[PDB]
């Protein structure tokens, strides 16, 4: 049930984003742990430094490296994932 | 009404965060704009690169530069502000 709202990344990395987040929602209930899982997977796979926010109510303003930004919904939870540093 | 929950940052810079966020909450109604305002002010004053999340429900896992992290509440909104890159 993935709705990508904003993305500056390749399609493959987008798809990896969605699937990594889906796995994290299957495994964890707390937003922070879901975010931790995603962030850690991405630092491992794609190199640091990634940052992830998971929640139903937030606004953000962030800065990211070219081609390394995604903001999408999975059901009712919004997920922001991006690389910086 | 600032409740600092988690901080790795000088006291002065902490107090600047809170004041900056208070001014932002007076001025803007939308979380994203509040975050935008705070992030932008911090890039100007303390050099890039800062990132800011403002909301009533989210979890996060992020990485920051030593002494450049704060997470606090201001009324019913939580604010995450940190520097990386």
């Amino acid at each position: 049930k993935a709705v990508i709202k904003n993305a500056d990344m390749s399609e493959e990395m987008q798809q990896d984003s969605v699937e990594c987040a889906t796995q994290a929602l299957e495994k964890y209930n707390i937003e922070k742990d879901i975010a931790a899982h995603i962030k850690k997977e991405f630092d491992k796979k794609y190199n640091p430094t990634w940052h992830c926010i998971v929640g139903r109510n937030f606004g953000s303003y962030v800065t990211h490296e070219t081609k390394h930004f995604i903001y999408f919904y999975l059901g009712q939870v919004a997920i922001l994932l991006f690389k910086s540093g | 009404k600032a409740v600092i929950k988690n901080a790795d940052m000088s006291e002065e810079m902490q107090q600047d965060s809170v004041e900056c966020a208070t001014q932002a909450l007076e001025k803007y109604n939308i979380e994203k704009d509040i975050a935008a305002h705070i992030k932008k002010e911090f890039d100007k004053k303390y050099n890039p690169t800062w990132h800011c999340i403002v909301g009533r429900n989210f979890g996060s896992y992020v990485t920051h530069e030593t002494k450049h992290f704060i997470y606090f509440y201001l009324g019913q909104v939580a604010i995450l502000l940190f520097k990386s890159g």
Partner: peptide, 11 residues
């Protein structure tokens, strides 16, 4: 590396 700022808002 190019750096770009972005804002997001849940509805």
């Amino acid at each position: 590396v190019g750096m770009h700022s972005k804002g997001t808002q849940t509805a």
